């Protein structure tokens, strides 16, 4: 079991951040070309928000989200400063209520 970070966005909102999803798929490339493991994902209306533990964000949600994610605390206290319009926290996976913390709703 690991801690993953989260930021919740809408889908609307995050498609007005462009100059952001550039970030980061220059993140990914980066990644590769250093042979580090992603440890960051875009997840489009995840799974993890149906959790018993993660009520108060669904009940705060936007109907069709998007979440950036990462064991790496410190790139989500980035996204949170970037974005500003997000909601953040955390959970730990796989549990029986998030056995996919990657998973899609749709």
């Given at each position: 079991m690991a801690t993953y970070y989260y930021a919740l966005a809408s889908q609307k909102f995050l498609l007005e951040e462009e100059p952001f999803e550039e970030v980061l798929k220059e993140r990914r490339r980066d990644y590769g070309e250093k042979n580090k493991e992603i440890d960051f994902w875009q997840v489009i209306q995840?799974?993890?928000?149906?959790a018993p533990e993660l009520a108060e964000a669904k009940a705060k949600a936007p109907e069709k989200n998007v979440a950036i994610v990462s064991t790496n605390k410190s790139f989500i206290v980035w996204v949170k400063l970037r974005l500003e319009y997000v909601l953040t926290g955390e959970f730990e996976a796989p549990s029986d209520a998030i056995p996919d913390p990657l998973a899609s709703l749709d």
């Open positions: 995840p799974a993890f928000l149906n």
